[PDB]
């Protein structure tokens, strides 16, 4: 749980965001996720900010990023058959 | 018996029943046979080679009656052959219980084909590796019915099954006609059996049964030895 | 690979690897031997103390199936109990139907068929047991049988089941059977079990001896082992 | 008895080259009639009928069961059914209820499907076949119809004398009977055609 | 040519074969044993040696000749558990024949029923196919003696001079070189040829204590197992 | 005992069912039927898969199975599975007649067979029925009908049908020659002759290799006309003369 | 029988076949449905017909009672089975309690069947998603949807089938209370939503309504044509 | 590890690993200790909790007027064998109108747990029974295992880090046989004070004791009638 | 990278950090088909007696 | 690589039950608090769409007239167990004229929390919070898929249970009151939820020895929320 909060602090410390948002709610929606998926969430939230012309993220950008990465590409997701170490 | 009940028979990616194609190949690797319908009777003939000179020819029988007027041979594996023979035996007697009348050969082939098809669907079991040649003289016109492992069946004027069935079939297309007698049927049958067998064909290497409208009759090695004078 | 999995499959050279692996499962158990005399059968089981681990009287491998038949099991233990319960049930059916004591051949054949029937399929595993069966009757004499994990059941004068198997039968074959009463054979098996299976990996061990024959008047019971204490007074004289 | 619950009489008579089957029309509850158009003779294919007599429940039940098995047989085999085959089928269907018996006495009358050979037979309530050459009867008024057919039958009969003989037999044997009356239907069939006539019976 | 699972269960391969039964045909070969049957004029002879390496092992319970019924004997090869289970199936169905049909079962029908049972172990792919070989002998009215064999594949057959086990390519070669040459068949032509064909295949020339001889004759239609004395008589009877 | 299990029921992770489509691609080979309902009657067409010279033709039937008095069905797929289906279907319709003493309407017959097929698609791992098959028939409520069974259990009424993979172009041809109810029984037969002439690549359509059966409406008979070969021959001659008349436009 | 468990949990906490059998719903035809306050309306889009054949057998909207109505998505055969069992259940409820069958009961039955169907030994889960619209006692219009998981779940307008995200986004910017004021406007609202969905040629637009004191009326596709025509007229009046 | 999937598969070393895995499932319970005198049998367990606010998962449960069991591992299989235990007790209590001796009951437990350890598609029961009882011939302290190889002992201890408990029991097994209830029970919980790290022990919050006596019915105690038993102790060494 | 099927891939390539965008290409509609037929007939002497619909 | 579903682990646990304990975590949160005045309870609905009619989502369902409940994660596996638990409580009051206590209810449920198998299928996927007022005062009870049933004084479950348990142990003690615990729960709720806390998000369920039945209609929730 707290690992993903800290990895959000890692990928978020040097990027243009709105610091008034939280990060714990973002971590609570990523139960089985890797740091790579976290990185994709951060970058894709930035890419949704590039759809408009802004200089700061919104919470809704990160929610778009979560439902863009996790729930959509969770059909591939790389770890339902490596957690069993096949 | 355990709770599995799952069919091991699966279609291919293309759509093909690989275990039935393999069962047809296992039929094709068996002993050859030929059977000919010729206006008054039907002749069946097999090719029964002992492996050594030690074996006896009075124990195992290829030509086998199902009722008093219905003969039946195969081209495949005897161990499955006897099982489905026994099934056909038990099945014909229920018809004769119900209707008090000897079963027609088409009705036999319907029910046996239903059994074999229903068994290849059934779970955890392999198909039979047996192709039949069923015949009989029901209601004047005699018949001849070939089945296969896939459950299907046909109706032939003359056919063959086993090794070199293609060569025997190309001999049958040229040789047979519409009208013959039983003796000429035996003549062309031993000719096409002599097409593929070894050189020494005696009263025991072949085994021949006929059908009359007066009933089924299974010929003896006596008349088989009588026949191969001026052979084929 | 692939051919060691099921108990139904054969090998490219024609044997069942499940049955072999189950045979060498019993190979790690303790050495338990048996031998008959001209009027009885004597059993004996090496039981090992580690330090405490129990009380002088648990899990005794010398079972007692019928009034005149008992087991001398070795191998996986719970499977041996289930097999003993099946054997008690079978002797019960025989006593209930035909009205007399079970002959040891029929008992061994029924048990062998059950063990063999558990080897035929993929739903069940083969047994991990190998056990002994002794008896005595006034019209039958002494009979000693032996059932492997596969189900091969035939008769012996002497046998051995466990780790030390040849080295326990090296001196079974130096005894004889016609000239012995079983009261010598008690201390003979006792002194040899104390001889075999040295102190090296296990430190303390403990002896059990079952005992059937004419001297028990057809009964089967454990020896009064504390009475006459016949092992140890010769076993400590067996070290030189 | 249970056979005398609803009355009933079925007569079949073999002629020279043809066969005639007749039955009564009355339906009712032991002394109370209900209708005059109750069907007891059923068509089973062409030129082959069956008659059913006794308790009406088993009449309609066995008729529908037999029609079930009959259509299954004629669809499993493209030919139409021989009469001995039908007799054996009715015998097996009745004998399946050996201890749960139907109360009926089926009468089969039909021609040969290959030749013009006639055929008659009757069965009992457990499945006992009986082939004869002259006539079979079934129902309450047995002895009346026995007296008529053993009195009036000739071996070689043109269909007109066949019709008049079975007419007089049914009329007189029914008029002596009490619980069975109220009209007669007569089926006179042959190789070429099928004729159905109704007689002027006493409506009492 | 193998596809999928066709090396583990009984299915069809691309070459068309099934591999379980053609592994079962050398499941016989781990027995290390040889069997020879002979049928002559009005007798029939079984011969089979025994392999007892142990002095502690008995001699009575090593018997392979199993008297199935009062006119039917048999011998077994292959693994022992399959053999004995096959024997109890044979005994049970012969007794069922005697109950249902009244008269004594002919040796043909017994082989047919056993072959069909073996087919049921073969036909379904979720039971192991019993890797043992079965030899039958018997007397029939109006036909004299018979000798039949039942295989694990389920093909019964039966013939004049019959042999299966370990070394029987050579045994059937010698029996082609011996029964095709017009020999007559006495009680001692059959017995002498039975002991000597195995005595030339194995080349041992041994004691009367290794082979077992089961005979049946139309003077005594009971199945009969010979004693060491008359075995010794035949053995010195072939000593020119 | 589970590593041998073939899993012919669990969805595939592409998104569809797996074994179902391969049963469909098993439908696609060995078979080519259609019928033309466009008033007073309905017909069926069929191709001989075993047109070899050494058969008997003694069955007085072929691909058609007169399953009742007023319904038949054309088969395509593996034959003997369909025999299992025709036996069960015939018995279903006959038990309905046993239950009501009124003939069986064609859609509850179709849905009964569709529930049987879906019953083996849904649960167990059993092999699905690789048979699609047609339906012609009559009722009290709509007249002449046509239905298309599928191995999934899905069905669907048509006015011009199709099973086999050779006959998708036939559906294209049926649309390009679509009529609004014009089956004088010579127009529809000539159209069917034209379709089977074009779609099968058998040059000039030998009449032994084809099969046509019709179903007309009679008051007390409801005859099913499994017609003989001579009218097929003169139908082929009629159509080849009309193709010669049609190519005078070039 | 078939002693096996088809649907196993995932290593990360899923049911593969429940979440994955939603994809079969996701690749089926689209169907919307709203409730007005007095007239209920629903209909399916994308019949994707051959335009030249029968259409009385491909009807995707049926009824279980004279009070309740259907719709579904996914594959049609599982819908056929579930509808047969639902008809049996609603009529058996009428056997007992003498009311007309409440819609909430039949949705609980369908979802309960679906869940005990996914739970059981080796039964493949139902890849459908139904819509159950009815107006029980005292005229209250309600509408529920199903799911392969088996969660009856009351909505106010529909979003299933192909591209349901787009359709719900149009219903999102079209949640006007004004739209459910005029029954005709509610019908036109379904037509406009389905027009903001697929081709909507006025051919695959199969719609059926119920005015809650009658039975279901399937509309003849000339009235729907005039509905689309007046929708296009209002769209021209927007400029 | 293609032999490590099922119960049916023998290993090529003969060790069927489903039983070993069930053993390791027993090893992950709480610590517990059972030990007998000549006249009294005492089993003592240790409770644990999921969090601070929640209560502690109880271990000692009742079976019969003279039989009580300890437990370690899973709780569903625990209650399953528990229900079977009460049922088999009250069956003979019904039929023979006598109390059951413990040894035949534990033989029935082994015969019960054999079948899910041999067929295919059943698990071995993860269970950690320590059984104390009274037949006519005095106290018995049995333990089970998922391999159904039940033992009779004089003192066992199963659960997490239970081996130090066995070391304490060895250097006092001579002293155990003579003493009365009080110092016996406090020897059992001195086994428990060495099954723990040296700074949190048994402050009336985690221990339970079940005594059966020749006149005493089997009775469980928890923290409050254990507060009399917890005094009479000294500290741990340096 | 471009594939036909994706389910037969080893998912270790398909994790993010390697590949971030996964894009579906469906069979489009019956509207952009008009653009496809239009552009693939944009450079030809189309006889106007045909309809692309 | 598909093994048998009734396989333990190399480490010891199982597999499928552990995967069920993982499958809890995606569900919505819930918070129940035992107080001697009575048991209070709270939950989040997780409203997704405005088309989604809000009063139809059930989280607190009713077992008895005095035994409450709340579910999590999968809804419908919970619905089966709720129905059956009701049936067995009705059997107890019938054959005993008395109230089946909450511990006996949960023993009856976790008797078949794991009867999953191929003969005589999967493990269930729901965490449950059980309350009510028996003779032993108020009771709050928590089970799991593994049947490992324990009493909890104030347990928080599901997706936000880490900070819920932590910040709950911050505020909780033994002598709390009712309304203080209610607002103490919903403060934690609107720290752990994602949407704005309003009239439609959450729902309460309180059962008391005085307030005899669990009764909680709408718009006293409004009065409770405007008290923040």
Author numbering:
A (entry chain A): 348 to 433
B (entry chain H): 3 to 234
C (entry chain M), E (entry chain G): 5 to 244
D (entry chain P): 2 to 205
F (entry chain I): 2 to 251
G (entry chain J): 2 to 240
H (entry chain L): 4 to 241
I (entry chain B): 329 to 381
Recite the paper's sentences.
The structure of the ATP-γ-S-bound RP–CP subcomplex in the SA or SC state was nearly identical to the ATP-bound conformation in the same state13. In both human and yeast proteasomes in the resting state, all six nucleotide-binding sites are occupied. Consistent with these observations, we identified nucleotide densities in all six Rpt subunits in the density map of the SA state of our ATP-γ-S-bound proteasome. All previous studies and the present work suggest that full occupancy of six nucleotide-binding sites stabilizes the resting state, in which the CP gate is closed in both human and yeast proteasome holoenzymes. Binding of six nucleotides in the ATPase ring may lock the topological relationship between the RP and the CP in the SA state, so that it does not permit a continuous movement of the AAA-ATPase module. In the SA state, the pore-1 and pore-2 loops from neighboring subunits were found to pair with each other, constituting the constrictions of the AAA channel. Interestingly, in the SA map, where the α-ring in contact with the RP was closed, the opposite side of the CP was instead mostly open. Nonetheless, the SA state was still the dominant population (~50%) among the ATP-γ-S-bound human proteasome structure snapshots.
A set of ubiquitylation pathways conjugate ubiquitin moieties on target proteins, which are then recognized and degraded by the 2.5-MDa 26S proteasome holoenzyme. The proteasome is composed of a 28-subunit barrel-shaped core particle (CP) and two 19-subunit regulatory particles (RP)5–8 capped at both sides of the CP. The globular domains of a substrate are mechanically unfolded by a heterohexameric ring-like subcomplex in the base consisting of six distinct subunits, Rpt1−6, which belong to the ATPases-associated-with-diverse-cellular-activities (AAA) family.
